[PDB]
Structures are given as C-alpha cells and as structure tokens.
Amino acid sequence: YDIQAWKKQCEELLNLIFQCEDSEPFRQPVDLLEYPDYRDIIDTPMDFATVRETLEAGNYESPMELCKDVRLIFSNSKAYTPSKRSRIYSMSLRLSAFFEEHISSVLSDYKSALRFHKR
Ligand SMILES: CS(=O)(=O)NCCc1ccc(F)cc1
C-alpha cells in the first residue's frame, strides 16, 4: 500500500525500455529534418527521454499519467506509419507489448494503495 512506490518502479521500467533495441526509434523526439510528414500528422510528439525527464522533474502525479504519455509514443508511431509492416511500427508493437506486460502491476498496486489510503 505504498502510494509512492510507482515512481521507482517506472524509473526501472524506463531503464529496461532504454536497454531494449526496439526502443531505438523512440528514445528522443522524432527528427523533423528527417521526417517531414511529422508535425502535419502528429499533434503531440512524445518520446521516452521526455517521459523520463517529466518523471524525474516530479511532473507526473500518478503512473496513469506516465502510461498515457508512453501510449502516445505508440499511437504516434501507428498514426505516422505508411504501412503496418514498417520497421519502426513493428518495433513499436513489440515494445508496447513489453511495456503493457510490465506496467499492469504498477498501475494495480498504485490504485490499490490509493483505495487503501482513502478507506
Ligand atoms: C528520433 S529520430 O531519429 O527522428 N527517429 C524517429 C523515428 C520515428 C519516426 C516517426 C514516428 F512516428 C516514430 C518514430
């Protein structure tokens, strides 16, 4: 029932994501010099360095907010892809599965801790 435990759990999951080769296209903001269809199709860019810096700045109140930003990395990749078979999009699907598999307990524990706090 530790209401704060999610933050270090998210830091460690981000470390695992950065070690994963599938995170390479998503570690830093998309290069607008390399990708021109970018801001015309993506309204809210997101990447893992931005997520890590928001977390480290104390600018996430809950792991749900972090999850929303990580899910935006994946939905931006899906919206920008010219094909479901593209390399970057295929990497995003595997990385998303890995992320969802690991964030599930973080979210469950935090929501349970908050329910206990408010009992
Ligand atoms: C940091 S980068 O060197 O510009 N690589 C970005 C690859 C990418 C391009 C479009 C997307 F929707 C998602 C990822």
Domain boundary assignment for the chain: 1-119
| Cβ contact 72:45 at 8 Å | no
Q: How many CB atoms lie under 10 A from the CB of residue 68?
A: 12
Query: Which pair of tokens denotes residue 85?
Result: 């078979």
| Cβ contact 91:105 at 8 Å | no
Experimental method: X-ray
The architecture (CATH level 2) of 1-119 comes to Up-down Bundle (1.20)
List, as one string, the DSSP characters of the chain: --TTTHHHHHHHHHHHHHHSGGGGGGSS---TTT-TTHHHH-SS---HHHHHHHHHTT--SSHHHHHHHHHHHHHHHHHH-S-TT-HHHHHHHHHHHHHHHHHHHHHHHHHHHHHHHH-
**CA–CA–CA angle 90, 8, 52 (5° rounding):** 50
Q: What whole-number distance in Å separates Cα of residue 49 and Cα of residue 66?
A: 12
Query: Which atom in ligand 1 lies closest to the alpha carbon of residue 29?
Result: 1
Report the pocket of ligand 1 as residue ranges, CB < 6 Å: 25-26, 28, 30-31, 34-35, 76-77, 80, 88
Q: How many CB atoms lie under 10 A from the CB of residue 103?
A: 20
Resolution value (Å, 1 decimal): 1.3
